[PDB]
Design a protein around this ligand. Structure first.
Ligand SMILES: Nc1ncnc2c1ncn2[C@@H]1O[C@H](COP(=O)(O)OP(=O)(O)OP(=O)(O)O)[C@@H](O)[C@H]1O
Ligand SMILES: Nc1ncnc2c1ncn2[C@@H]1O[C@H](COP(=O)(O)OP(=O)(O)OP(=O)(O)O)[C@@H](O)[C@H]1O
Ligand SMILES: [Mg+2]
Ligand SMILES: [Zn+2]
Ligand SMILES: [Zn+2]
Lengths: 302, 662, 445
DNA sequence: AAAAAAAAAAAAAAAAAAA
DNA sequence: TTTTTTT
């Protein structure tokens, strides 16, 4: 199996286009990325009309030969780290599924489904979505998995659409210690009220930042806005090494000090924050209180 | 085997055709052609054909284009061979093209097995009248107008037969697209009998034949045109459209006919043209800027230079100053025209709301203001240009019309003028004198972008994306400043409101302005005087020196820039001032008809948005910035201000100074 | 040669009789219910076919016309097996069962069809413009000779691989010294099926730049006939094949056409005069109708992007619902529709409502008052190219009978064209007296 | 081997006419 | 001068 977004349920072209690893490796958010992708497809020899068909109806001979095609072509672009070994579950004549696809469907179903009062309503719809995902586990239901798969497609599309805008506008400010970016205004901001969706976006962003010529591993701070509450949701993200790296430089995983920094600043100053997430690296802050708080975080020992 | 190029100079057989097919000759020709297209260095020191192959691989199309003069400058004997014997040359050249292409893309054969090489521009040009006996079985270059297009049908490429009287399977056979394969002795048995086609193992092509007349601007006056038939093989299908002027490079061939010999009493033969390359020549008659099948297409380095020069400061200033470098003044028009020919982004909300994304422009003023020259330059500039004038266009002419087919004997639709303008511009001269029945028919074309016909039992709806640029003259031949716009023209609100940018140009008496204009005009006349390495490149550099003194950038680069900007870049609009634009629109709703005469509606707000999007397009940016919004609002407010009476012009000008503060 | 056919038929029968989800054999139950209500047809979903086995799908993909008849006779074999008792050894009025497919492959537009799709299964969508009348086709022919005078039966399958595909008449007689083909067709004691022809036009918003829409021809037969009406968006699944043109220009031409295998429609032929909705959908409609304020829900839902106008939206909803048709003992009719005219200033978005209203109503046509004529709306009299006989072809207002018509720029139309609609909207019946053709044709809109 | 065409209906452009 | 109607 390969690091591909819903390979067995979307066309191979869209799979390569939305796969985060290929995105990071070849910069598909501008034109040269698409040109290199088309060159790769041509050198493989799959037609652009063929590669844009569903995996079921796509040609059987090249379905069989896909492994050899990848082995012989991917070396030039250096994407050979996309091939791995995984698990596949088959139930009679129903079809085939894989662990990565199933967990992505579950994650998307958790994300999307169906002042204090609004916060309580959000926290209760989160539990409702959790129970819906739980019920989706059993093998007697598949209409709660097809919906999850299509919603995963939609969510990944929206995340890509927002990330291309971020990297185009160059909102990533490089401070002395830690990078910072704030989504002041844009599209589809209402989706990012979910911490897991925000983490997915941040994971893609940190992958993109890592897959560059920069040799600095800096923590990242990301913020959002919901005009209904007039609050900023802030999450701290750790740097990540390139996936294709040896294990010798893996003595200790990169730690996360953001929870300690947040608790120390909240203890020493009377900010209007609300630290109640089980993930201690995610806090809520006020719009007027954000900027001085950030200053403090800059001036504090990390 | 002496595989030397010089040995091809002297022929050993009686004719060229029987000498080319010689086994010794063919392989030498193939290897020389290979060494040509693998190594031909352009002026930049890089093989242009390498870039051509890369682009073809990216686009996985079915046509590789070879410049003729490139082949002429090096290995000219092969150019002569191709000019005299096309059939025996093109096959070998296709084979070497496949070899070269799979040198870059191995296993590309799964995409396509063969290629159809096209020649760019032959040196000699013939018209339909100057066709003789000698120019047969050789390349010709014919200009014409398409009249009747047949359609798309499949063909047989590799024909095989099964002879059942002996059970003999015949080998694959070709076809020449105007004959029938006739087999006499039926393979080794040497016996005549029945056989079947058994086309379960066969491969298909598709062709399309069309009627080619003479260009009405080329025929001698008061004479009649000469028709010919053109057959279009695979990959050239539907490239040509009815009603357009085209130029075709092809092969002239002859064939026998029965009824032709019947009606004349003499052994006369029919002739058809097998198309080999097609180049559109509608509107854009300036055919000296560059060569090639398509002048609006770009190479990769041209895209790189587009990106490089799209980022410098004040690029909009250079672009606006680089349009019509032979007309003095009229900065506002020089800006409105650019904003009109870039256009906006069409908007589709949920598939149930449609917002037009193109800008109309109207000009108005006294005679002698060079409006027609601007219109001519616009026609020369855009990718799709349609020119009309005054009484010379009827309402049913601009729009599609219902016609009865004189052969198939029923009704059918005929493409109107606006249909050719789809994805392009339609230019109207003398807008005011056109009869109102000929004027009211384009409301949907301006606004809804749709054409609907319910005539003679046919109920269909077409599609038209056209930007209308019009010019006219006010009542009495001169614009009276002390009257509102309602008493200066005969148009009404419904037609006026559809126009986004409306410019009024006045003729006024001045001293130093007249002196400067006269100096510029005289220097322009003395500049364009016909009497002031390879000769052609020295001519080209002289032309470049002549052009660089008034235009900041060369025009062919500008045309390719226009095409690139219209094709790829799509701006997006996020960070715009809600209250600023809302207050501006409220202010324009105030005053206006409530104090004056000019009508203002919600469509002008969409016009402001579209102008801002166009300004964003000018810089090859995906996101609108605030400066572009400022420029758009400045243009709109200025256009509204300078269309009022002189009694209130200064007062309104000082009133509106806060939104365009800058 | 026969062994391959037997193996293929056996494999298809095994698939039919062995496929099951959870605790249900879906296709066997489908066959039983179909036979009970005299709908001799079966529907195969391609995903199930692929999942059960891939080699059978490969064989169906390679040669459709050669393979389909084997499946459509295996179906009738299974039906005879599971519907009729052998009674240790009758009517047997079971013809060959019709096979209908459904799939979810990538759509291919009309203009992208080329020589590489010959004899392949493709999926496409368009708009229906013209429908031919029904016609008969023979499937079982009784053949009698003249000299030897013996009887024979010929079985005809309706699938064509080559252009001919037809054994006209056997050469010589069956065994003295007869002629070449001394056979005649016994019209009595034969079996006939029904066939219809349709025309497809390209979808408006996929037309390439500066082009005119292209037409294509389709053939449907048996139950697929009389399912669509002109002017309804459809999705077709079938085979793209060719037929020779001897009666026709060019060399080796072969006009292409489409053989319909499956049709999906947006209206599901529901209005084409009884109700056939399932209980779930009817219950849902009743539940929505039970809402105490659904009037405001519908009023808001009319053109959500248009702001401010309220009475016009209420009037549009009232028009969409329509009145109540009436009749009387003495024959007097009473109109059952309402006609709304918008007469307003520019810039108020009048037509933006017209195209949305065209989108909502199940039967709607949009046309401009400038590009219209009296003869081009009510009824047009043509004459055939070949037989010259005059016939009546309807225009626009009759094409949208039983729905609503969207006219914009009502003033720009000529005075002569604005008088023909008087009776057409006051009495809903248009009368034509041209070339000896007298006809009272109805139009309710 | 050949029925093939006079009679209608509908769609324009030009010119002249009336207001 | 303009729009209408007829050829
Ligand atoms: N700066 C200029 N401003 C105006 N005219 C200029 C200028 N420079 C040159 N000209 C000349 O003035 C003439 C104006 O064009 P032309 O006489 O064809 O009519 P127009 O002004 O376009 O419009 P109209 O036909 O309505 O009178 C052209 O011959 C053009 O070459
Ligand atoms: N109330 C409104 N809300 C939103 N948009 C509006 C409204 N009124 C007009 N518009 C805008 O007007 C624009 C053009 O409208 P449109 O041309 O359809 O108007 P109309 O009244 O039908 O005009 P016409 O009488 O000239 O045919 C649209 O882009 C639409 O967004
Ligand atoms: Mg309108
Ligand atoms: Zn033989
Ligand atoms: Zn007999």
């Amino acid at each position: 199996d390969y690091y591909l977004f819903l390979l067995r349920h979307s066309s191979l072209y869209d799979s390569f286009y939305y796969s985060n690893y290929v995105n990071a490796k070849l910069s598909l958010w501008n034109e040269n990325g698409k040109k290199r992708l088309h060159k790769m497809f041509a050198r493989m020899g799959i037609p652009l009309s063929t590669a844009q068909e569903t995996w079921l109806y796509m040609d059987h001979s090249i379905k069989r030969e896909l492994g050899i095609i990848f082995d012989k072509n991917l070396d030039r672009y250096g994407l050979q780290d996309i091939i791995r070994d995984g698990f596949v579950r088959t139930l009679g004549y129903r079809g085939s599924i894989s662990a990565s696809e199933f967990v992505e469907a579950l994650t998307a179903l958790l994300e999307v489904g169906n002042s204090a009062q609004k916060l309580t309503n959000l926290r209760k719809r989160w539990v409702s979505n959790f129970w819906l995902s739980w019920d989706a586990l059993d093998d007697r239901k598949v209409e709660l998995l097809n919906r999850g798969i299509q919603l995963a497609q939609d969510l990944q599309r929206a995340i890509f659409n927002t990330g291309v805008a971020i990297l185009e506008k160059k909102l990533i400010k490089h401070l002395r210690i830690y990078r910072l970016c704030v989504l002041q205004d844009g599209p589809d901001l209402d989706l990012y009220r979910n911490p897991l969706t925000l983490l997915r976006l941040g994971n893609w962003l940190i992958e993109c930042c890592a897959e560059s010529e920069d040799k600095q591993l800096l923590p990242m701070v990301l913020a959002s806005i919901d005009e209904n509450t007039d609050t900023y949701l802030v999450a701290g993200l750790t740097p990540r090494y390139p996936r294709g790296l040896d294990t010798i430089h893996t003595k200790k995983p990169i730690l996360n000090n953001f929870s300690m920094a947040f608790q120390q600043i909240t203890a020493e100053t009377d900010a209007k924050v609300r630290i109640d997430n089980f993930e201690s690296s995610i806090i809520e802050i006020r719009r007027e209180d954000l900027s001085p708080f950030l200053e403090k975080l800059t001036l504090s020992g990390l | 085997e002496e595989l030397t190029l010089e040995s091809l100079s002297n022929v050993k057989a009686n004719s060229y055709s029987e000498w080319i097919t010689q086994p010794n000759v063919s392989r030498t020709i193939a290897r020389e052609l290979k060494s040509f297209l693998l190594e031909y260095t352009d002026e930049t020191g890089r093989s242009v054909y390498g870039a051509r192959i890369r682009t073809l691989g990216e686009m996985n199309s079915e046509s590789l284009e070879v410049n003729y003069r490139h082949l002429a400058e090096s290995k000219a004997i092969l150019a002569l061979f191709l000019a005299k014997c096309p059939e025996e040359m093109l096959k070998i050249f296709d084979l070497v093209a496949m070899e070269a292409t799979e040198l870059h893309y191995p296993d590309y054969a799964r995409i396509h097995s063969e290629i159809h090489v096209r020649i760019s521009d032959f040196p000699t040009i013939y018209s339909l009248r100057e066709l003789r006996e000698s120019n047969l079985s050789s390349l010709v270059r014919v200009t014409g107008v398409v009249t009747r297009r047949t359609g798309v049908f499949p063909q047989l490429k590799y024909v095989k037969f099964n002879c059942l009287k002996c059970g003999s399977i015949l080998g694959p056979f070709f076809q020449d697209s105007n004959e029938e394969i006739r087999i006499s002795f039926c393979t080794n048995c040497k016996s005549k009998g029945p056989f079947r086609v058994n086309g379960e193992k066969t491969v298909y092509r598709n062709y399309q034949r069309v009627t080619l007349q003479e260009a009405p601007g080329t025929v001698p006056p008061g004479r009649l045109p000469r028709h010919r038939e053109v057959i279009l093989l695979a990959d050239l299908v539907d490239v040509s459209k009815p009603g357009e002027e085209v130029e075709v490079t092809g092969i002239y061939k002859n064939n026998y006919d029965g009824n032709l010999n019947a009606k004349n009493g003499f052994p006369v033969f029919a002739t058809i043209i097998e198309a080999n390359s097609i180049k559109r020549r509608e509107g854009n008659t300036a055919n000296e800027g560059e060569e090639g099948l398509d002048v609006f297409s770009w190479t990769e380095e041209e895209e790189r230079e587009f990106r490089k020069i799209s980022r410098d400061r004040g690029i909009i200033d250079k672009i606006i100053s680089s349009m019509a470098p032979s007309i003095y003044g009229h900065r506002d028009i020089k800006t409105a025209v650019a904003c009109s020919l870039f256009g906006g982004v069409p908007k589709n909300v949920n598939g149930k709301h449609s917002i037009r994304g193109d800008i109309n422009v109207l000009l108005l003023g006294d005679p002698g203001t060079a409006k027609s020259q601007i219109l001519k330059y616009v026609e020369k500039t855009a990718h799709r240009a349609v020119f009309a004038t005054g009484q010379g266009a009827s309402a049913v002419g601009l729009t599609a019309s219902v016609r009865k087919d004189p052969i198939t004997k029923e009704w059918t639709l005929e493409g109107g003028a606006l249909v050719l303008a789809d994805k392009g511009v339609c230019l109207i001269d003398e807008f005011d004198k056109m009869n109102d029945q000929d004027r009211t028919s384009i409301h949907e074309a301006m606004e809804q972008q749709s054409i609907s016909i319910s005539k003679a039992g046919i109920v269909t709806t077409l599609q038209a994306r056209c930007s209308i640029i019009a010019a006219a003259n006010p009542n009495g031949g001169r614009y009276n400043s002390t009257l509102p716009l309602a008493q200066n023209v005969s148009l009404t609100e419904p037609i006026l409101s559809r126009f986004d940018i409306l410019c009024v140009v006045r003729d006024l008496v001045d001293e130093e302005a007249d002196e400067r204009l006269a100096t510029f005009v005289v220097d322009s006349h003395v500049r364009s005087h016909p009497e002031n390495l390879n000769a052609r490149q020295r001519r080209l550099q002289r032309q470049r020196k002549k052009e660089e003194e008034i235009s900041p950038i060369p025009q062919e680069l500008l045309m390719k820039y226009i095409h690139y900007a219209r094709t790829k870049i799509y701006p997006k609009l996020h960070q715009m001032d809600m209250d600023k634009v809302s207050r501006v629109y409220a202010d324009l709703r105030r005053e206006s008809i409530s104090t004056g005469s000019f009508p203002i509606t919600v469509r002008h707000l969409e016009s402001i948005l579209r102008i801002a999007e166009s300004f964003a397009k000018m810089r090859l940016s995906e996101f609108v910035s605030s400066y572009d919004l400022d420029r758009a609002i400045k243009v709109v407010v200025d256009s509204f201000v300078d269309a009022q009476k002189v009694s209130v012009r200064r007062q309104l000008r000082r009133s509106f100074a806060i939104y365009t503060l800058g | 040669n026969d062994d391959d056919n037997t193996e293929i038929i056996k494999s298809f029968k095994n698939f039919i009789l062995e496929f099951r989800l959870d605790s249900q054999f879906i296709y066997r139950d489908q066959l039983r219910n179909n036979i009970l209500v005299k709908n001799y047809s079966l529907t195969v979903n391609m995903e199930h076919l692929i999942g059960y086995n891939e080699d059978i799908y490969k064989k169906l993909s390679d040669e459709p016309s050669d393979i389909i008849p084997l499946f459509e006779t295996a179906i009738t074999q299974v039906a005879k097996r599971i519907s009729i008792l052998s009674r240790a050894q009758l009517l047997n009025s079971l013809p060959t069962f019709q096979l209908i497919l459904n799939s979810n492959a990538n759509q291919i537009p009309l203009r992208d069809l080329d020589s590489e799709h010959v004899s392949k299964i493709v999926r496409l969508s368009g708009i229906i413009i013209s429908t031919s009348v029904l016609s008969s086709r023979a499937t079982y022919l009784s053949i009698m000779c003249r000299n030897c005078r013996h009887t024979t039966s010929i079985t005809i399958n309706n699938f064509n691989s080559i252009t001919g595909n037809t054994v006209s008449l056997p050469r010589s007689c069956l065994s003295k010294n007869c002629g070449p083909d001394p056979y005649i067709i016994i019209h009595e004691s034969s079996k006939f099926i029904d066939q219809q022809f349709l025309k497809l036009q390209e979808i408006p918003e996929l037309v390439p730049v500066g082009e005119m829409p292209r037409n294509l021809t389709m053939t449907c037969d048996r139950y697929l006939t009389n399912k669509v009406i002109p002017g309804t968006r459809v999705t077709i699944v079938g085979i793209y094949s060719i037929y020779n043109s001897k009666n026709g220009s060019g060399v080796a031409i072969r006009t292409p056409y489409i053989k319909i295998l499956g049709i999906q429609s947006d209206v599901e032929t529901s209005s084409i005069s009884v109700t056939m909705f399932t209980e779930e959908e009817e219950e849902e409609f009743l539940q929505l109708s039970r809402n105490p304020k659904l009037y405001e829900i519908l009023t808001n839902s009319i053109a959500p992007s248009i702001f401010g106008n309220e009475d016009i939206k209420k009037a549009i909803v009232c028009l969409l619902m329509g009145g109540s048709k009436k009749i009387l003992p003495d024959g007097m009719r009473l109109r059952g529709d309402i006609n709304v005219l918008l007469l307003g200033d520019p810039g108020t978005a009048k037509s933006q409502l017209l195209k949305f209203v065209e989108k909502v109503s199940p039967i709607a046509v949009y046309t401009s008052g400038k590009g219209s004529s009296a003869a081009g709306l009510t009824a047009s009299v043509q004459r055939d190219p070949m037989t010259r006989e005059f016939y009546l072809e309807g225009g626009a207002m009759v094409l949208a009978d039983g729905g609503v018509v969207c006219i914009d720029e009502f003033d720009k139309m000529r005075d002569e064209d604005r008088v023909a609609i008087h009776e057409a909207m006051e009495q809903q019946t248009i009368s034509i007296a041209k070339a000896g053709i007298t006809t009272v044709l109805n139009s309710r809109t």
